[PDB]
Amino acid sequence: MNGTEGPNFYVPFSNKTGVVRSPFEAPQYYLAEPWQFSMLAAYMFLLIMLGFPINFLTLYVTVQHKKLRTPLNYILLNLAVADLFMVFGGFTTTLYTSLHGYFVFGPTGCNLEGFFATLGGEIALWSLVVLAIERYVVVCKPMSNFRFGENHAIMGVAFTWVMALACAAPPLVGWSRYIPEGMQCSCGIDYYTPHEETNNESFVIYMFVVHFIIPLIVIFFCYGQLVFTVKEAAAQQQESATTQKAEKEVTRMVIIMVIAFLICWLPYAGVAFYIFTHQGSDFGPIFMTIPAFFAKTSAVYNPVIYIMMNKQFRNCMVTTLCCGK
Amino acid sequence: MNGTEGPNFYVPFSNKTGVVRSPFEAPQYYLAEPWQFSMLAAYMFLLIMLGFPINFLTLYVTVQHKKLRTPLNYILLNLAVADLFMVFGGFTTTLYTSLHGYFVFGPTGCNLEGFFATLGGEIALWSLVVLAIERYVVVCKPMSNFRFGENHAIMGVAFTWVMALACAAPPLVGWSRYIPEGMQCSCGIDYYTPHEETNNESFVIYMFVVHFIIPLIVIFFCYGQLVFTVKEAAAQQQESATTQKAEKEVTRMVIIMVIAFLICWLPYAGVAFYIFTHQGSDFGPIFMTIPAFFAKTSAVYNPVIYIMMNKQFRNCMVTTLCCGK
Numbered sequence: 320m321n322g323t324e325g326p327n328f329y330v331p332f333s334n335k336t337g338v339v340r341s342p343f344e345a346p347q348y349y350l351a352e353p354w355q356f357s358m359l360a361a362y363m364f365l366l367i368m369l370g371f372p373i374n375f376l377t378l379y380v381t382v383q384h385k386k387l388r389t390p391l392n393y394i395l396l397n398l399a400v401a402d403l404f405m406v407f408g409g410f411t412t413t414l415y416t417s418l419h420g421y422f423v424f425g426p427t428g429c430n431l432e433g434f435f436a437t438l439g440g441e442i443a444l445w446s447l448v449v450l451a452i453e454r455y456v457v458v459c460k461p462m463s464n465f466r467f468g469e470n471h472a473i474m475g476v477a478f479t480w481v482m483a484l485a486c487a488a489p490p491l492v493g494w495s496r497y498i499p500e501g502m503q504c505s506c507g508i509d510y511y512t513p514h515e516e517t518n519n520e521s522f523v524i525y526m527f528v529v530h531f532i533i534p535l536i537v538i539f540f541c542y543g544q545l546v547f548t549v550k551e552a553a554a555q556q557q558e559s560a561t562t563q564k565a566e567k568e569v570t571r572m573v574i575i576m577v578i579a580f581l582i583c584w585l586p587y588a589g590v591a592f593y594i595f596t597h598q599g600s601d602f603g604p605i606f607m608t609i610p611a612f613f614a615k616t617s618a619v620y621n622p623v624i625y626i627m628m629n630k631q632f633r634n635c636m637v638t639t640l641c642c643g644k
Numbered sequence: 645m646n647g648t649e650g651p652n653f654y655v656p657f658s659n660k661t662g663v664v665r666s667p668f669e670a671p672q673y674y675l676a677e678p679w680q681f682s683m684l685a686a687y688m689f690l691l692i693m694l695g696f697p698i699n700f701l702t703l704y705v706t707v708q709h710k711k712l713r714t715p716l717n718y719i720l721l722n723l724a725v726a727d728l729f730m731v732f733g734g735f736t737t738t739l740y741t742s743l744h745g746y747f748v749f750g751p752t753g754c755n756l757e758g759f760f761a762t763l764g765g766e767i768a769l770w771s772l773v774v775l776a777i778e779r780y781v782v783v784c785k786p787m788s789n790f791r792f793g794e795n796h797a798i799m800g801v802a803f804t805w806v807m808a809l810a811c812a813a814p815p816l817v818g819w820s821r822y823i824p825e826g827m828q829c830s831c832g833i834d835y836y837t838p839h840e841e842t843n844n845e846s847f848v849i850y851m852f853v854v855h856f857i858i859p860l861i862v863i864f865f866c867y868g869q870l871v872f873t874v875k876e877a878a879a880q881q882q883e884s885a886t887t888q889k890a891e892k893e894v895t896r897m898v899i900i901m902v903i904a905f906l907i908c909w910l911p912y913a914g915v916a917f918y919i920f921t922h923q924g925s926d927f928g929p930i931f932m933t934i935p936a937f938f939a940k941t942s943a944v945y946n947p948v949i950y951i952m953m954n955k956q957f958r959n960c961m962v963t964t965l966c967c968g969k
Contacts, residue, residue: 364690368694
């Protein structure tokens with residue numbers, strides 16, 4: 320056959336060889352050599368360290384600074400909160416799996432793995448819509464006295480949260496499940512089999528048609544309505560105003576932001592298409608594993624772009640660095 | 645017997661078991677389980693990342709800043725140079741060894757490993773003497789118009805360099821050798837055997853009695869002559885002068901610096917004593933391996949203490965961070 324099947328695992332290699340044994344108990348050096356295995360482990364601790372201290376620093380900075388209550392501060396504060404939950408309940412069990420080659424917890428650890436991965440991805444993707452609509456408002460001006468505060472901004476964060484605890488949880492109860500992908504070292508969603516028992520096919524369609532292309536195209540047509548008035552050909556300040564210069568700053572920032580997110584997240588499910596619709600001829604392990612694990616660096620590069628161009632936020636950073644001036 | 649012997653390796657485990665085979669070709673999961681092995685690999689990439697970018701940043705900072713030509717800038721610039729050479733020609737082959745369990749290069753890679761380890765340690769240890777004598781001069785005042793510049797400071801860096809290329813090189817030619825220690829994953833100097841063929845015993849004595857205790861006690865008696873006039877019980881500025889306040893700043897900094905170096909480097913050869921003089925009863929693997937690899941974090945925490953208290957150097961850092969102001 321064109322792979323290998325199990326009740327909680329799918330090795331992407333033919334069991335006609337007669338070597339596939341218990342993967343959640345045994346290591347899996349016979350699917351792939353241990354050199355790229357240890358490479359992936361090191362590449363995970365990479366993001367663990369590069370996340371933790373900058374995250375805690377940005378948390379304490381925005382905790383101390385009662386000067387910036389523009390809602391983007393709130394957005395990248397609660398994104399940082401979700402990323403704290405991610406780095407605690409996320410990469411540590413993946414690194415233990417890459418340490419031993421399997422969840423010693425068994426499917427319990429695999430269920431713990433995806434409990435924050437797709438959740439964090441969902442927050443990081445849908446949160447950029449809430450600011451996109453804001454930028455469109457400040458550019459097109461349907462109102463005159465409108466601005467976002469304690470009764471226009473936190474509602475969008477609650478939107479992202481209530482979809483986060485409605486898009487990440489449903490596989491936990493049996494409408495979907497978790498199955499190891501990649502080198503069978505990362506638990507996600509199946510594309511290898513229909514598996515009508517847990518109702519995955521309708522679940523996979525319900526996930527893709529709701530969460531992937533629709534907010535994507537709302538973002539693209541917000542960008543399809545953000546090339547006329549304010550110009551990407553930047554020369555210097557004072558196009559219209561100084562707060563509008565800050566608008567232009569955040570505009571170019573979010574353009575490069577969503578472009579980086581595109582470059583990251585395109586092949587992640589671009590290969591899942593080929594695995595889902597077209598199964599039966601054959602497929603490759605490097606064909607799928609590499610582009611999916613390209614995208615595990617997503618939230619870690621969200622604070623640094625906020626350091627890149629935001630001027631006075633960087634002033635807050637460099638002031639409260641030594642906690643002096 | 646009380647261990648296991650070879651022509652280029654010494655497994656710290658009895659070969660009466662009848663399992664010791666080629667270590668430089670085979671992995672060594674049968675000496676110790678692979679969990680702490682992968683732990684050590686991750687703990688190496690830890691220091692690799694935590695070294696590289698801060699090192700390049702400090703290099704370019706001191707390259708741009710023609711404002712601070714006080715010699716401590718030169719000292720921690722050329723220490724950073726030696727650390728660039730270290731992180732290039734050092735931890736990468738150790739991480740490859742921890743990736744595969746052995747030098748694929750064979751003894752060539754093991755010889756490449758120690759070519760910068762003891763060299764970097766020698767520079768980091770002896771360089772702190774050159775500033776210690778300086779602080780003692782500024783505290784005791786034998787002269788009146790004396791200060792360190794382009795003809796008093798670089799001579800000390802040349803001292804450290806000419807001992808660096810006289811203390812690290814001699815094992816390369818046959819007066820000593822390199823042999824894997826720890827989990828047999830780190831090449832250093834033997835304490836398990838006399839091995840009179842390559843003349844190690846006289847070499848080990850010549851190393852310890854010259855490089856370890858003598859500069860150590862010169863440092864301690866410089867500290868034995870640095871508790872009377874300027875006081876560690878600090879209250880605020882203006883004890884004598886503002887440049888003398890900078891002297892007090894660097895004084896407390898170097899006190900904590902050498903104390904941290906003491907805490908790091910004490911057991912590293914404190915266990916080598918027990919292995920060298922007392923061999924024949926038995927010894928433990930955790931007895932030696934843990935305290936030696938505690939000390940592999942030495943140079944990486946040298947820039948951050950320079951960030952800790954140095955005020956205007958930190959001003960140079962935060963100014964040239966964005967390359968503006």
